[PDB]
Design a protein around this nucleic acid. Structure first.
Ligand SMILES: [Mg+2]
Ligand SMILES: [Mg+2]
Ligand SMILES: [Mg+2]
Ligand SMILES: [Mg+2]
Length: 1341
RNA sequence: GACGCAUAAAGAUGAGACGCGUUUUAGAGCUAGAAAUAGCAAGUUAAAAUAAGGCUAGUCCGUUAUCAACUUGAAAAAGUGGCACCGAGUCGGUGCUU
DNA sequence: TTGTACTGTAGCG
DNA sequence: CTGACGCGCTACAGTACAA
DNA sequence: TCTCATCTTTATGCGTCAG
């Protein structure tokens, strides 16, 4: 009758088991359908479902954004062509058509094969005149002659297409601020403004500072040594105030007009001209030299004056490349003639031919050519250019991402100013071309859809087509920016219909402070017991402490309120630890801004303050904030309004306005916040107010409050967890269906939750500011003195990484700049392409070009030898962990490898936590569907949430050891053990039922006490318990309920039952058959070839002439029975075979299968015999051999080795020889146990050999492993047992993979033949595998 | 085992952008050559595509999630498979039942 | 002309 | 006042031989 | 790789959810 279900859930597995009250697994004779002879099969009700883990939508989002970027770039080019079309039709009516056709081969082109001029001699003269595009760009910028319109279009199209980044918001004009000689009129302005007439002994410019590094510690000492110092903080020119602004908003030093806060002149210094702009030049020259220093970092130098410094630098790269190539060829020919063919012709050895024609990058070419340059003479300049990474550089390189869009904008504007007189249409629509270059859709607007995209939220004022020129008159940017946030913030849980408050809302901070404060109790010598704080006392302490300090500690509450107001000698306070967790931060911010305490304390103006904070949280754009905030200009002055628009807030709370202050009690008339302010002597907090039946909040919340697929479509989060939730809920539903529609007594779910000690939990959750303090104190820096920081600012990732690295780049020995973090780069040590790991142990803040050069690989050996001392200096200072140092020094150990790819990722842990929590919720909702008028829910099925520690201790205390390498049976065994432990726990201790059942609750540190409680509850399974004093204590062999004589655990029969279940050979292991979805092929495009396997990259692009893709992905295979037109003397020969339907042929095949199969050469196709066969489709062959269909042309192993439990225990104990960490006597018992069954190794080999000879049929590998095992049979038990554990990869279910023994490495035996399964028995397994449909394919065709 | 706050860690979801990379074409190769070729010269750039494509034709969408077999149903979705005992090499045997 | 077996390939910061 | 007992893992491409 | 935002699950500190 009664039964229970245990569940062990993972990211790729769902283990399930059915137990009775006797802890036995039932077995039933299940019906078998199909045309086979077998009509009934015996199966045990225990098993595991295996499936591929669900993928996150990160890669799909990246592909979608790349698609949109390509579409918008093509549209920019189309707009430029639309402007140029009518004028280009005069001079060359087929120019744009030749540019469109330029991909095509000569026989496919409708026009002449030369794109630009349409004839050979003019094209050759063009390429001689302008070797690169940058020569043409510099010619069009600098010269004044009338040029051909085609060349102007080519330069403007190259500028618009590759337009540079938008991380700089200013103008940054390169026409006059590019030059470094602005220092001389800076000191002319210094002489004019500062009325002392100083001597302008002008020395070297910022080139002297840039010679070593752009830093204060170089600049200040350099220009104080060069020109004599009259004022250290008030030198008034080329200062750190004017180049790289200070970290805090500190006042001006030696002010000229007023004392105002100073910062970097990027975007937050515009308001810092209130010294003169608010009271009506050195600051204009400061802006000019800021532009000069920024652009001198971006671009190296221009010696001869020009308005195109980027093109000049690119031409300098071309000229130096030409000179160095000529010199290198001469030196190689003169000194190493045999190496000339390898370097300059053979393009596969990473030479110059491999650097240009081949696929070798710049650093591969440098590391190949560095020894060659070292052995040769006369290579000193080439060596010093290689060390600077400046030798033989290209123009289109990886480090061009540092160029802002303003440089390209300046060069384009220069070209249009040169050519406007000759071409009137350039002057007519110069602003349109500049807008095409400079327009960028705001991130708060999103896609420009018209109601057909599920990603778009933008609303438009009119139904016209959106262009970069009419974007402001069509797109409603305020509503789109509001909907950007309102579509993304969650709703209130208690009131599901309306939105939550901002985190920094004044009402939210008030509610949080009063919720924390209303349960604070104080005691003294006056009275007998601690008493709650009254409403008057709470109001007084809020006014005295919470509105005068941003953070208030309990010590301040002792000595400033109770010592003076209602004077007591000493008071003991409970309800709070050393500091209050709540604070009125927004009140202090608005007191600092508005300078009006009475305005904030006033009651009637509370709503407008709420709307102000809502505006400051929703919006961050200055014009939108001023658009929303101009309503309140009649209360606030203009200066204070300009200051208040700067107060950016980010983050939202969990409660709404209606919950905390909107709804009122029907009898009292008070809101929840009103009750928190004063509730008489009850002093109820938020949960009491929403749970007390006396107040009417409870049923108001109750009045505020289907298919499973719709029950899961509405849950937010990652889509990866929905797969596991679907699988386990379908497994539970099928298990309920198996037992005749009877629900279990209880369902036990293994959760990844834990319990750990109070000091361990607090040590793992300390502030990262403390980490910074002890690390920097240990390594003895003064970085916190120069750049102060609080804990809330380290929540930013880049600032946290800057402080972790002690202000220095950890790939190159140079200092970082705290104010320029937008251009620095956050880098993963182990790259994203290899392993998914976003830990703080895997993250570096480094310079951008060093990260881009260090692509898709571990950082190389040279940087390890350069900065390995600094990595050790940070390592012993506890600033980086040992794992981080191991990742940084990984290239010393061979770099990336297949061993490094193995092991679990922490995303799997987070995913399984999310999964099991949602499974507990959904199973509790589904199973208990009945309720009464007095009983709010009838617990028909008890969802029990066990923790993994209990099952792990049960395995490790009674020798039920688990190893994962042998078979996939451990999931089912874990499910069975979870069910046994959960049912025994709820049977043994009925008073602790509310502790373990979902939805129920029972109501030295608390966590330590709970950890000891959870450790001690497991003792009743044991026969003898060793106490902490080292003295044993006995328990009865038969356990009972205690309150009742009912029997809950017999340490005789039940342990034998559990041993029998764990040794059962038949376990229903099911691999989920899945139709493959995703990308059609591997993304690489291969060159042209005569093969037919190449896939066309476009409809009209024949891959025989244009190349194409390879490795197509088969969605599912299809069994076809038809005739094939085989033979020169053609006959219709009948055949039965699999055909792989790929992903892009999936829709075409499902549209009309007969026509698709007829196009493939088949004919007389049997339509009803078409069988869809997804991946991992299961076939059974002779002697119980099973194969899983990996593809139409490859199979997989499908059998599971049911090794006896004694061998598994021997393998677990033989390995981990001296790391059990139990007791010494236990260790010696397993020592003798493994030594006097050392012969079990031979029996394990015999078992593996028999299983492999029955089902694997890898005979050559079998002889290899037998020879290798015989040749090292004299090694110690440790390494032998460890590699017998490795040895099960040959017999493991799934795809074959290369394992390794002691020293031999066994290559996998691939099953690259699906011919045999065409006459095997096809098995259609249900989600549990109990229901089967066995189809004998030999009877078809 | 849930809620509010504080401090952690490890992760998700959406938008806007950049720089490369790959592929075909353009950038006249010269000489000795019956030649299979050999010597020499040159190399840095540009156009186009960047999932085939789709229709509601948008400066939109197209790699996430769904998916054993059979019977109904456009689809959504619904339905279909006896029990007890003795045993165990991937499940077998024995006995009642319609 | 068709099956096998061994080794290499695979978008990224 | 209320419980005891103190999580993971390869299909196809290219070349070279057996018939 | 950059810039913007919004969440989630676990660990500790405090309070609470009741017959
Ligand atoms: Mg588990
Ligand atoms: Mg990287
Ligand atoms: Mg598992
Ligand atoms: Mg998929």
């Amino acid at each position: 009758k009664k039964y229970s279900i245990g569940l062990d859930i993972g990211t790729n597995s769902v283990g399930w088991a059915v137990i009775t009250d006797e802890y036995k697994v039932p077995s039933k004779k299940f019906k078998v359908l199909g045309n086979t002879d077998r009509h009934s099969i015996k199966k045990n009700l225990i098993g595991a479902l295996l499936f591929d883990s669900g993928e996150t939508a990160e890669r799909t989002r990246l592909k979608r954004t790349a698609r949109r970027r390509y579409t918008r770039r093509k549209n920019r080019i189309c707009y430029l062509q639309e402007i140029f079309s009518n004028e280009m039709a005069k001079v060359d009516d087929s120019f744009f058509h030749r540019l469109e056709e330029s991909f095509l081969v000569e026989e496919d082109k409708k026009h002449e094969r030369h794109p630009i001029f349409g004839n050979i001699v003019d094209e050759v003269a063009y390429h001689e005149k302008y070797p690169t595009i940058y020569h043409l760009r510099k010619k069009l910028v600098d010269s004044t002659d009338k040029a051909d319109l085609r060349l102007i279009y080519l330069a403007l199209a190259h500028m618009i297409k590759f337009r540079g980044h938008f991380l700089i918001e200013g103008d940054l004009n390169p026409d006059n601020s590019d030059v470094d000689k602005l220092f001389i009129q800076l000191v002319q302005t210094y002489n004019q403004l500062f009325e002392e007439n100083p001597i302008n002994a002008s020395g070297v410019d910022a080139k002297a500072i840039l010679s070593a590094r752009l830093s204060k510690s170089r600049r200040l000492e350099n220009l104080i040594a060069q020109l004599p110092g009259e004022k250290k903080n008030g030198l008034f020119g080329n200062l750190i105030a004017l180049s790289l602004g200070l970290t805090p908003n500190f006042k001006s030093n030696f002010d000229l007009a007023e004392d105002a806060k100073l910062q970097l002149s990027k975007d937050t210094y515009d308001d810092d001209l209130d010294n003169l702009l608010a009271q009506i030049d050195l600051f204009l020259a400061a802006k000019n030299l800021s532009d000069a220093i920024l652009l001198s970092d971006i671009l190296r130098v221009n010696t001869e004056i020009t308005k195109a410094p980027l093109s000049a630098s690119m031409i300098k790269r071309y000229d130096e490349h030409h000179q160095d190539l000529t010199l290198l060829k001469a030196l190689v020919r003169q000194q190493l003639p045999e190496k000339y063919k390898e370097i300059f012709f053979d393009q596969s050895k990473n030479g110059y031919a491999g650097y240009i024609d081949g696929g070798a990058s710049q650093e591969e070419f440098y590391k190949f050519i560095k020894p060659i340059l070292e052995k040769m003479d006369g290579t000193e300049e080439l060596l010093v250019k290689l060390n600077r990474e400046d030798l033989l550089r290209k123009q289109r390189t990886f480090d061009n991402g540092s160029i802002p869009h303003q440089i390209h904008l300046g060069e384009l504007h220069a070209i249009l100013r040169r050519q406007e007189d000759f071409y009137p249409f350039l002057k007519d629509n110069r602003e349109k071309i500049e807008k095409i270059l400079t327009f960028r859709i705001p991130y708060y607007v999103g896609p420009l859809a018209r109601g057909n995209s599920r990603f778009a939220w933008m609303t438009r004022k009119s139904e016209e087509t959106i262009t970069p020129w009419n974007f402001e008159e069509v797109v409603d940017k305020g509503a789109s920016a509001q909907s950007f946030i309102e579509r993304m913030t969650n709703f209130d849980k208690n009131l599901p219909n309306e939105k939550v408050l901002p985190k920094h809302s004044l009402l939210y901070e008030y509610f949080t402070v009063y919720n924390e404060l209303t349960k604070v109790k104080y005691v003294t010598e006056g009275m007998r017991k601690p008493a709650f704080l009254s409403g008057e006392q709470k109001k007084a302490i809020v006014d005295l402490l919470f509105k005068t300090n941003r953070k208030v500690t309990v010590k301040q509450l002792k000595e400033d309120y109770f010592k003076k107001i209602e004077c007591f000698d000493s008071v003991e306070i409970s309800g709070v630890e050393d500091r209050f967790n709540a604070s009125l931060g927004t009140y202090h911010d608005l007191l600092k801004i508005i300078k009006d305490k009475d305005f904030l304390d006033n009651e009637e103006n509370e709503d407008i303050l709420e709307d102000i904070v809502l505006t400051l949280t929703l919006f961050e754009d200055r014009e939108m904030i001023e658009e929303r905030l101009k309503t309140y200009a009649h209360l606030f002055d203009d200066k204070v309004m300009k200051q208040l628009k700067r107060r950016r807030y980010t983050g939202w709370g969990r409660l709404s306005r209606k919950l905390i202050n909107g709804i009122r009690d029907k009898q009292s008339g008070k809101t929840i916040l009103d009750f928190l302010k004063s509730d008489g002597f009850a002093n109820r907090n938020f949960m009491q107010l929403i749970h007390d039946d006396s107040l009417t909040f409870k049923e108001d919340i109750q009045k505020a409050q289907d298919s499973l697929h719709e029950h899961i479509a509405n849950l937010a989060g990652s889509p990866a967890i929905k797969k596991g939730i679907l699988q386990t809920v379908k497994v539970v539903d099928e298990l309920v269906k198996v037992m005749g529609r009877h629900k279990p007594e209880n369902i036990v779910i293994e959760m990844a939750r834990e319990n750990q000690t109070t000091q361990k939990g607090q040590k793992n959750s300390r502030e990262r500011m403390k980490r910074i303090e002890e690390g920097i104190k240990e390594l003895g820096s003064q970085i916190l003195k120069e750049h102060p920081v609080e804990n809330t600012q380290l929540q930013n990732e880049k600032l946290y990484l800057y402080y972790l690295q002690n202000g220095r780049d950890m790939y190159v020995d140079q200092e970082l700049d705290i104010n320029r973090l937008s251009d620095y780069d956050v880098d993963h040590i182990v790259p994203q392409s290899f392993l998914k790991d976003d830990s703080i142990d895997n993250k570096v803040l480094t310079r951008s070009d060093k990260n881009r050069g260090k692509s898709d690989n571990v950082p190389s050996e040279e940087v390890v030898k350069k900065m390995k001392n600094y990595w050790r200096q940070l390592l012993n200072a506890k600033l980086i962990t040992q794992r981080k140092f191991d990742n940084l020094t990984k290239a010393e150990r061979g770099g990336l490898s297949e061993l490094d790819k193995a092991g679990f990722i922490k995303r799997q842990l987070v995913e399984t936590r999310q999964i099991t929590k949602h499974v507990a919720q959904i199973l509790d909702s589904r199973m208990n569907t009945k309720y009464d008028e007095n009983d709010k829910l009838i617990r028909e099925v008890k969802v029990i949430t066990l923790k993994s520690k209990l099952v792990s201790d049960f395995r490790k205390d009674f020798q039920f050891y688990k190893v994962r390498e042998i078979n996939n049976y451990h999931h089912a065994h874990d499910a069975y053990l979870n069910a046994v432990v959960g049912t025994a726990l709820i049977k043994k201790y009925p008073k602790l039922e509310s502790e373990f059942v979902y939805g129920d609750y029972k109501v030295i540190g608390k966590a330590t006490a709970k950890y000891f409680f959870y450790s001690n509850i497991m003792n009743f399974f044991k026969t003898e318990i060793t106490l902490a004093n080292g003295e044993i204590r006995k328990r009865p062999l038969i356990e009972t309920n205690g309150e009742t004589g009912e029997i809950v655990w017999d340490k005789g029969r039940d342990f034998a039952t559990v041993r029998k279940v764990l040794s059962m050979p038949q376990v229903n292991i099911v691999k989920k058959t899945e139709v493959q979805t995703g990308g059609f092929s591997k993304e690489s495009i291969r060159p042209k070839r005569n093969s037919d396997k190449l896939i066309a990259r476009k409809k009209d692009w024949d891959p025989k002439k244009y190349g194409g893709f390879l490795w197509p992905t088969v969605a599912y295979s299809v069994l076809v029975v038809a005739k094939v037109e085989k033979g020169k003397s053609k006959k219709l020969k009948s055949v039965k075979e699999l055909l792989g339907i790929t992903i892009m042929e999936r829709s075409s095949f499902e549209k009309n299968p007969i026509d698709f199969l007829e196009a493939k050469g088949y004919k007389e196709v049997k339509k009803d015999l078409i069988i869809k066969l997804p991946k991992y489709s299961l076939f059974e062959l002779e002697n119980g051999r099973k194969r899983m269909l990996a593809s139409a042309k490859q199979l997989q192993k499908g059998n599971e080795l049911a090794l006896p439990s004694k061998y598994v225990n021997f393998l677990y104990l033989a390995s981990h020889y001296e790391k059990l960490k139990g007791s010494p006597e236990d260790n010696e018992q397993k020592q003798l146990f493994v030594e006097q069954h050392k012969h079990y190794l031979d029996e394990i080999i015999e078992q593996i050999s028999e299983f492999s000879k029955r089902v694997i049929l890898a005979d050559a590998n079998l002889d290899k492993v037998l020879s290798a095992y015989n040749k090292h049979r004299d090694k110690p038990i440790r390494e032998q047992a460890e590699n017998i554990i490795h040895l099960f990869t040959l017999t493991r279910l799934g795809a074959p993979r290369a394992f390794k023994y002691f020293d031999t490495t066994i290559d996998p035996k691939q099953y690259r033949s699906t011919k045999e399964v065409l006459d095997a028995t096809l098995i259609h397994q249900s989600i549990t595998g109990l229901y089967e449909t066995r189809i004998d394919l030999s009877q078809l065709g």
